[PDB]
Curated annotation (Swiss-Prot), chain B:
Belongs to the NTC complex (or PRP19-associated complex), composed of at least CEF1, CLF1, ISY1, NTC20, SNT309, SYF1, SYF2, and PRP19. The chain holds residues 493 to 541 of 590 of the full protein. Belongs to the CEF1 family. Involved in pre-mRNA splicing and cell cycle control. Required for the binding of the NTC complex (or PRP19-associated complex) components to the spliceosome to mediate conformational rearrangement or to stabilize the structure of the spliceosome after U4 snRNA dissociation, which leads to spliceosome maturation. Its absence leads to an arrest of the cell cycle, possibly due to the inefficient splicing of TUB1. It comes from Saccharomyces cerevisiae (strain ATCC 204508 / S288c) (Baker's yeast). It is found in: Cytoplasm; Nucleus. This is Pre-mRNA-splicing factor CEF1. Present with 784 molecules/cell in log phase SD medium.
Length: 58, 49
């Protein structure tokens, strides 16, 4: 019964090492997720400005 | 008479075992269940990894 206790804790040890590492993946991509949305926004902000500038220029 | 003697001496020893082991087999068989759910939780998270 003590043998089954020491065998069981190793899997719940392996339950942490994946769960900490998989959120260490998603923590990095979210920073990349917010950077591209920042650069795409200034792209879209400059896009709608030029579409209305050239109409006012003509 | 061996069915008289040997069967009832085992029935006395098995119920003396049933007082002491059948509490701890339920402690063992449910600690087995702690492995078999932690096994399928570990497989899906290494997939998620």
């Amino acid at each position: 019964d003590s043998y089954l206790k020491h065998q069981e804790i190793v899997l719940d040890t392996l339950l942490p090492q994946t769960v900490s590492n998989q959120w260490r993946i998603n923590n990095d991509y979210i920073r990349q997720t917010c950077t591209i949305v920042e650069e795409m926004n200034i792209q879209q902000r400059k896009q709608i400005n030029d579409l209305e500038i050239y109409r006012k220029r003509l | 008479t061996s069915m008289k003697i040997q069967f009832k001496t085992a029935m006395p020893p098995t119920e003396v075992l049933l007082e002491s082991i059948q509490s701890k087999v339920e402690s063992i068989e449910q600690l087995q269940r702690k492995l078999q759910h932690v096994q399928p939780l570990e497989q899906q998270n290494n997939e998620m990894c």
